[PDB]
Write an enzyme that holds these catalytic residues in place. Structure first.
Site, PDB file in Angstrom:
ATOM      1  N   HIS A 314       0.803  -1.224   0.000  1.00 44.48           N
ATOM      2  CA  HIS A 314       0.000   0.000   0.000  1.00 44.48           C
ATOM      3  C   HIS A 314       0.843   1.285   0.000  1.00 44.48           C
ATOM      4  O   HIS A 314       1.716   1.513   0.866  1.00 44.48           O
ATOM      5  CB  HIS A 314      -1.008   0.009   1.148  1.00 44.48           C
ATOM      6  CG  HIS A 314      -2.245   0.648   0.663  1.00 44.48           C
ATOM      7  ND1 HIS A 314      -3.335  -0.077   0.242  1.00 44.48           N
ATOM      8  CD2 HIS A 314      -2.580   1.913   0.514  1.00 44.48           C
ATOM      9  CE1 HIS A 314      -4.297   0.719  -0.193  1.00 44.48           C
ATOM     10  NE2 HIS A 314      -3.878   1.956   0.013  1.00 44.48           N
ATOM     11  N   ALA A 315       0.615   2.079  -1.050  1.00 46.30           N
ATOM     12  CA  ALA A 315       1.210   3.399  -1.208  1.00 46.30           C
ATOM     13  C   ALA A 315       0.823   4.262  -0.001  1.00 46.30           C
ATOM     14  O   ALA A 315      -0.348   4.274   0.384  1.00 46.30           O
ATOM     15  CB  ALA A 315       0.664   4.008  -2.489  1.00 46.30           C
ATOM     16  N   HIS A 344      -0.610  11.573  -6.410  1.00 47.25           N
ATOM     17  CA  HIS A 344      -1.349  11.559  -5.172  1.00 47.25           C
ATOM     18  C   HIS A 344      -0.412  11.667  -3.966  1.00 47.25           C
ATOM     19  O   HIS A 344      -0.626  12.506  -3.055  1.00 47.25           O
ATOM     20  CB  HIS A 344      -2.154  10.264  -5.068  1.00 47.25           C
ATOM     21  CG  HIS A 344      -3.034  10.199  -3.847  1.00 47.25           C
ATOM     22  ND1 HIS A 344      -4.300  10.744  -3.820  1.00 47.25           N
ATOM     23  CD2 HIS A 344      -2.819   9.731  -2.630  1.00 47.25           C
ATOM     24  CE1 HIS A 344      -4.847  10.547  -2.621  1.00 47.25           C
ATOM     25  NE2 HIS A 344      -3.950   9.892  -1.887  1.00 47.25           N
ATOM     26  N   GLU A 345       0.559  10.751  -3.907  1.00 41.90           N
ATOM     27  CA  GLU A 345       1.421  10.605  -2.739  1.00 41.90           C
ATOM     28  C   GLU A 345       2.310  11.835  -2.645  1.00 41.90           C
ATOM     29  O   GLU A 345       2.489  12.367  -1.585  1.00 41.90           O
ATOM     30  CB  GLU A 345       2.269   9.329  -2.663  1.00 41.90           C
ATOM     31  CG  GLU A 345       1.408   8.080  -2.667  1.00 41.90           C
ATOM     32  CD  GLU A 345       0.431   7.918  -1.509  1.00 41.90           C
ATOM     33  OE1 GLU A 345       0.727   8.600  -0.454  1.00 41.90           O
ATOM     34  OE2 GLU A 345      -0.609   7.166  -1.663  1.00 41.90           O
ATOM     35  N   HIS A 348       0.564  14.595  -0.891  1.00 43.55           N
ATOM     36  CA  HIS A 348       0.653  14.508   0.575  1.00 43.55           C
ATOM     37  C   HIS A 348       1.999  15.058   1.044  1.00 43.55           C
ATOM     38  O   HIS A 348       2.067  15.799   2.026  1.00 43.55           O
ATOM     39  CB  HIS A 348       0.576  13.055   1.061  1.00 43.55           C
ATOM     40  CG  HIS A 348      -0.787  12.460   0.976  1.00 43.55           C
ATOM     41  ND1 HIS A 348      -1.917  13.127   1.415  1.00 43.55           N
ATOM     42  CD2 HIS A 348      -1.215  11.267   0.519  1.00 43.55           C
ATOM     43  CE1 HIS A 348      -3.009  12.350   1.261  1.00 43.55           C
ATOM     44  NE2 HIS A 348      -2.602  11.189   0.714  1.00 43.55           N
ATOM     45  N   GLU A 372      -6.198  14.784   0.584  1.00 42.39           N
ATOM     46  CA  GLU A 372      -6.285  13.735  -0.424  1.00 42.39           C
ATOM     47  C   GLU A 372      -6.256  14.367  -1.816  1.00 42.39           C
ATOM     48  O   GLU A 372      -5.870  13.740  -2.803  1.00 42.39           O
ATOM     49  CB  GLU A 372      -7.528  12.868  -0.201  1.00 42.39           C
ATOM     50  CG  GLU A 372      -7.546  12.055   1.096  1.00 42.39           C
ATOM     51  CD  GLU A 372      -6.250  11.220   1.225  1.00 42.39           C
ATOM     52  OE1 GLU A 372      -5.728  10.655   0.208  1.00 42.39           O
ATOM     53  OE2 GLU A 372      -5.688  11.228   2.365  1.00 42.39           O
ATOM     54  N   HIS A 472      -8.766  -0.303   3.694  1.00 43.26           N
ATOM     55  CA  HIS A 472      -9.101   0.753   4.655  1.00 43.26           C
ATOM     56  C   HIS A 472      -9.945   0.265   5.850  1.00 43.26           C
ATOM     57  O   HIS A 472      -9.954   0.932   6.890  1.00 43.26           O
ATOM     58  CB  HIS A 472      -9.790   1.950   3.983  1.00 43.26           C
ATOM     59  CG  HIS A 472      -8.927   2.508   2.903  1.00 43.26           C
ATOM     60  ND1 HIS A 472      -8.648   1.766   1.769  1.00 43.26           N
ATOM     61  CD2 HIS A 472      -8.261   3.679   2.788  1.00 43.26           C
ATOM     62  CE1 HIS A 472      -7.850   2.486   0.966  1.00 43.26           C
ATOM     63  NE2 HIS A 472      -7.649   3.676   1.555  1.00 43.26           N
ATOM     64  N   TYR A 482     -12.109  10.585   0.621  1.00 46.26           N
ATOM     65  CA  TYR A 482     -11.870  10.250  -0.778  1.00 46.26           C
ATOM     66  C   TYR A 482     -13.048  10.740  -1.610  1.00 46.26           C
ATOM     67  O   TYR A 482     -12.848  11.218  -2.719  1.00 46.26           O
ATOM     68  CB  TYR A 482     -11.586   8.764  -1.058  1.00 46.26           C
ATOM     69  CG  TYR A 482     -10.320   8.256  -0.370  1.00 46.26           C
ATOM     70  CD1 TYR A 482      -9.066   8.683  -0.792  1.00 46.26           C
ATOM     71  CD2 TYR A 482     -10.394   7.409   0.744  1.00 46.26           C
ATOM     72  CE1 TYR A 482      -7.920   8.337  -0.086  1.00 46.26           C
ATOM     73  CE2 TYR A 482      -9.250   6.997   1.403  1.00 46.26           C
ATOM     74  CZ  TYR A 482      -8.019   7.448   0.969  1.00 46.26           C
ATOM     75  OH  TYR A 482      -6.907   7.062   1.642  1.00 46.26           O
TER      76      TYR A 482
HETATM   77  C1  LIG Z   1      -3.150   4.729  -2.495  1.00 47.84           C
HETATM   78  C2  LIG Z   1      -3.836   5.419  -1.282  1.00 47.84           C
HETATM   79  N1  LIG Z   1      -3.063   5.116  -0.026  1.00 47.84           N
HETATM   80  C3  LIG Z   1      -3.425   5.975   1.178  1.00 47.84           C
HETATM   81  C4  LIG Z   1      -3.328   7.436   0.802  1.00 47.84           C
HETATM   82  O1  LIG Z   1      -2.315   7.800   0.168  1.00 47.84           O
HETATM   83  O2  LIG Z   1      -4.268   8.208   1.099  1.00 47.84           O
HETATM   84  C5  LIG Z   1      -2.539   5.741   2.382  1.00 47.84           C
HETATM   85  C6  LIG Z   1      -3.312   4.571   3.202  1.00 47.84           C
HETATM   86  C7  LIG Z   1      -4.296   5.310   3.766  1.00 47.84           C
HETATM   87  C8  LIG Z   1      -3.437   6.407   4.462  1.00 47.84           C
HETATM   88  N2  LIG Z   1      -2.395   6.698   3.336  1.00 47.84           N
HETATM   89  C9  LIG Z   1      -1.415   7.753   3.474  1.00 47.84           C
HETATM   90  O3  LIG Z   1      -0.662   7.972   2.547  1.00 47.84           O
HETATM   91  C10 LIG Z   1      -1.491   8.709   4.735  1.00 47.84           C
HETATM   92  N3  LIG Z   1      -0.463   8.539   5.787  1.00 47.84           N
HETATM   93  C11 LIG Z   1      -1.418  10.107   4.147  1.00 47.84           C
HETATM   94  C12 LIG Z   1      -2.109  11.204   4.955  1.00 47.84           C
HETATM   95  O4  LIG Z   1      -3.093  10.845   5.575  1.00 47.84           O
HETATM   96  O5  LIG Z   1      -1.814  12.432   5.025  1.00 47.84           O
HETATM   97  C13 LIG Z   1      -5.338   4.965  -1.207  1.00 47.84           C
HETATM   98  O6  LIG Z   1      -5.713   4.064  -0.471  1.00 47.84           O
HETATM   99  N4  LIG Z   1      -6.326   5.685  -2.081  1.00 47.84           N
HETATM  100  C14 LIG Z   1      -5.993   6.736  -2.946  1.00 47.84           C
HETATM  101  C15 LIG Z   1      -7.357   7.148  -3.713  1.00 47.84           C
HETATM  102  C16 LIG Z   1      -8.469   6.119  -3.144  1.00 47.84           C
HETATM  103  C17 LIG Z   1      -7.968   5.282  -2.140  1.00 47.84           C
HETATM  104  C18 LIG Z   1      -8.116   3.769  -2.391  1.00 47.84           C
HETATM  105  O7  LIG Z   1      -7.177   3.207  -2.928  1.00 47.84           O
HETATM  106  O8  LIG Z   1      -8.992   2.884  -2.085  1.00 47.84           O
HETATM  107 ZN   LIG Z   2      -3.916   9.923   0.103  1.00 51.07          ZN
END
Ligand SMILES: C[C@H](N[C@H](C(=O)O)[C@@H]1CCCN1C(=O)[C@@H](N)CC(=O)O)C(=O)N1CCC[C@H]1C(=O)O
Ligand SMILES: [Zn+2]
Ligand SMILES: *[C@@H]1O[C@H](CO[C@@H]2O[C@@H](C)[C@@H](O)[C@@H](O)[C@@H]2O)[C@@H](O[C@@H]2O[C@H](CO)[C@@H](O[C@@H]3O[C@H](CO[C@H]4O[C@H](CO)[C@@H](O)[C@H](O)[C@@H]4O[C@@H]4O[C@H](CO)[C@@H](O)[C@H](O)[C@H]4NC(C)=O)[C@@H](O)[C@H](O[C@H]4O[C@H](CO)[C@@H](O)[C@H](O)[C@@H]4O[C@@H]4O[C@H](CO)[C@@H](O)[C@H](O)[C@H]4NC(C)=O)[C@@H]3O)[C@H](O)[C@H]2NC(C)=O)[C@H](O)[C@H]1NC(C)=O
Ligand SMILES: *[C@@H]1O[C@H](CO)[C@@H](O)[C@H](O)[C@H]1NC(C)=O
Ligand SMILES: [Cl-]
Ligand SMILES: [Cl-]
Length: 577
Positions: A314-315, A344-345, A348, A372, A472, A482
């Site tokens: 997971h990114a 996206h990343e 952040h 996001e 999630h 999201y």
């Molecule tokens: C690929 C993305 N991974 C998340 C994100 O980047 O938001 C990761 C896991 C959740 C937290 N996270 C973080 O990076 C936080 N520490 C950053 C922050 O909170 O500031 C993801 O899950 N996405 C992207 C679009 C839809 C959804 C899905 O894929 O279902």
């Molecule tokens: Zn994100």
């Protein structure tokens, strides 16, 4: 006393930096080298930060915030008074920490196996199946198998997690964990506001859904697609059917106007994960936004490591609370989906860098949706035909190529609207107790049907726990951010495009190199969580509400095309069957 509260917030700020840096470190080393040793040091660090949260949180509760003048300080102290999980008694806290760790591990190690065959992990193996198979039975094996292995194995934990997370929320003055999550928006009319936004996207969603269903009918056959009913959940190119762009080849509006596949061209030209990130960094600095530090490039993990070190895939983007160390961890595979995720990343990361001078209690986005949205905004520009051609990923005119691009964008952006909406409708009702473990699954399917128009290809049975099959849910990461992100990203794109002098249809806009567009995002991002979000919204867009206008305006030529197309065939919109 104003002076006593000022002093306290200064001490909180100093001490938090150290303890959060330490704990981010520990959590990083665990995440990019799952071992015994890394795992031990992690839970030891878990207790250290919980103890600091408790110490600081308790003192903050002794301030009458009624009596506090200064508003920055009032705001900081009100945040500190929330202990989150640190409110729980010793035993419950240890237990909840263990529950969350056990849920994440179950999810991340789940595999689906052929009998005397291979075992497939979720990334890349199952997601590649879901993306590229056009065999009903092969998609079902993957869809069903993932649910059998990941989703059911979460079920044992979920009821106790609900109980502990609700318990921490009531201990912090909320009614349940959902109320605590919603409170992050500071918007008492939230549920009604999101409802109105969702209702405005129904024309586009319903039209997209009906045209897609028709195309599936053509490929998968009359006996497996009801032209008046829900679509089977496994046929949309994605494990959760949350984005549909992997079936673009079955649904192309104008097959006569063909185009390169980005993914095929990226491979063809030897793109690496590192180049994808350098391209995102170049887009940010083209806007006058901040480059990622040299340290970022040395310390981040930009692909699966190759030294047999175990890592979570997971990114995710990481702030270490020292104002200088920021990182991404992504098992980046070389395609367009991940190029977007890279942006996206990096979005952040950019936010963390912009708000790095605020007190740590304010080091957050205006609301979780803003955080996001940042990267996605830039990636709207990146995805244009114009921009892709300039990266040498597309040959280069027509209306036909236009409607074709809009459809590609629709399968990612519009399809995700009902999915991003329903996830937390479900969890809000679990947390407030109106869904019990007796009907987790049935209630999930009721929302899958009501919002997305989907059905399960296979009857679900007791013991199924399909929600646990989405990352999630076991990870306890809120999801409404999201849905918010996807609405407000088009608003920000419209405002930045105007900022940059673009004229004509919004979907042709590319803000690359626009310093005016950078300036809008920077001043908002600089605010962190220091002011109510409508103020950040007003800085970017010139007005302070959330609005689907911009998304509708973006997609308007596609809506017209879909309407004429669905009308010519007699589609019945929706799925009363
Ligand atoms: C690929 C993305 N991974 C998340 C994100 O980047 O938001 C990761 C896991 C959740 C937290 N996270 C973080 O990076 C936080 N520490 C950053 C922050 O909170 O500031 C993801 O899950 N996405 C992207 C679009 C839809 C959804 C899905 O894929 O279902
Ligand atoms: Zn994100
Ligand atoms: C209510 O209280 C709040 C809170 O007060 C703060 O916290 C309490 C608990 C006490 O400690 C207070 O003493 C403390 O101030 C009040 O809000 C504060 O108000 C002041 C102004 O009164 C604001 O000052 C500005 O702050 C920025 C940024 O601050 C951080 O970053 C700097 C650079 O790295 C550094 O210099 C600072 O020390 C600070 O450091 C960080 O601090 C936090 C902890 O607070 C810590 O977590 C971080 O890790 C840490 N980072 C580092 C690097 O250590 C500062 O840069 C500003 O400069 C401008 O301000 C001058 C006076 O206002 C102005 O004359 C200068 O010209 C300059 O202006 C700009 O300069 C730039 C660059 O040179 C130039 O390009 C621009 O054109 C120019 N613009 C113009 C025209 O002015 C400045 O000092 C605080 O930010 C603010 N606190 C916050 C974050 O809200 C509030 O005033 C109170 N309200 C009332 C009604 O009284
Ligand atoms: C991976 O984890 C082990 C266990 O702590 C550690 O000793 C080792 O040095 C780590 N490898 C790297 C290169 O970080
Ligand atoms: Cl599902
Ligand atoms: Cl959220």
């Amino acid at each position: 006393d104003e002076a006593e509260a000022s002093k306290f917030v200064e001490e909180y700020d100093r001490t938090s930096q150290v303890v959060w840096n330490e704990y981010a470190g520990a959590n990083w080393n665990y995440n990019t080298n799952i071992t015994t040793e890394t795992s031990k040091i992690l839970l030891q660090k878990n207790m250290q930060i919980a103890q600091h949260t408790l110490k600081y949180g308790t003192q903050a509760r002794k301030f009458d915030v009624n009596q506090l003048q200064n508003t920055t300080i009032k705001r900081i102290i009100k945040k500190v008074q929330d202990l989150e999980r640190a409110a729980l008694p010793a035993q419950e806290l240890e237990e909840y920490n263990k529950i969350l760790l056990d849920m994440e591990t179950t999810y991340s190690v789940a595999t689906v196996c052929h009998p005397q065959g291979s075992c497939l992990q979720l990334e890349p193996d199952l997601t590649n199946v879901m993306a590229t198979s056009r065999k009903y039975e092969d998609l079902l094996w993957a869809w069903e198998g993932w649910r059998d292995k990941a989703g059911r194995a979460i079920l044992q934990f979920y009821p106790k997690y609900v109980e502990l997370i609700n318990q921490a929320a009531r201990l912090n003055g909320y009614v349940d964990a959902g109320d605590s999550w919603r409170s992050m928006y500071e918007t008492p009319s939230l549920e009604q506001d999101l409802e109105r936004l969702f209702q405005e996207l129904q024309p586009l969603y319903l039209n997209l859904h009906a045209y897609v269903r028709r195309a599936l009918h053509r490929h998968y056959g009359a006996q497996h697609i009801n032209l008046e009913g829900p679509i089977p959940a496994h046929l949309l190119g994605n494990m959760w059917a949350q984005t549909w762009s992997n079936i673009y080849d079955l649904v192309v509006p104008f097959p006569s106007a063909p185009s390169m596949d980005t993914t095929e061209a990226m491979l063809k030209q030897g793109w690496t994960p590192r180049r994808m990130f350098k391209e995102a960094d170049d887009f940010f600095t083209s806007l006058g936004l901040l480059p990622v530090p040299p340290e970022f490039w040395q310390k981040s993990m930009l692909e699966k490591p190759t030294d047999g070190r175990e890592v979570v895939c997971h990114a995710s983007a990481w702030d270490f609370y020292n104002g200088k160390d920021f990182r991404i961890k992504q098992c980046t595979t070389v395609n367009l989906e991940d190029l977007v995720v890279a942006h996206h990343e990096m979005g952040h990361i950019q936010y963390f860098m912009q708000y790095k001078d605020l007190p740590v209690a304010l080091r957050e986005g205006a609301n979780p949706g803003f955080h996001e949205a940042i990267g996605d905004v830039l990636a709207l520009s990146v995805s244009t035909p114009k921009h892709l051609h300039s990266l040498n990923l597309l040959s280069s005119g027509s209306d036909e190529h236009d409607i074709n691009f809009l459809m590609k964008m629709a399968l990612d952006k519009i399809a995700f609207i009902p999915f991003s909406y329903l996830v937390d409708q479900w969890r809000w009702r679990v947390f407030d107790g109106s869904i019990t473990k007796e009907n987790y699954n049935q209630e999930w399917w009721s929302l899958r049907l009501k919002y997305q128009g989907l059905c399960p290809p296979v009857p679900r049975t007791q013991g199924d726990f399909d929600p646990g099959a989405k990352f999630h849910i076991p990870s306890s990461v809120p999801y409404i951010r999201y849905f918010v992100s996807f609405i407000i990203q088009f608003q920000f794109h419209e405002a930045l495009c105007q900022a940059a002098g673009h004229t004509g249809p919004l979907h042709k806009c590319d803000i690359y190199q626009s310093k005016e567009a950078g300036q809008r995002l920077a001043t908002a991002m600089k605010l962190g969580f220091s002011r109510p979000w409508p103020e950040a919204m007003q800085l970017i867009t010139g007005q302070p509400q959330m609005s689907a206008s911009a998304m509708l305006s973006y997609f308007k030529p596609l809506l017209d095309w879909l309407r004429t197309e669905n009308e010519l065939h007699g589609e019945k919109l929706g799925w009363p069957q």
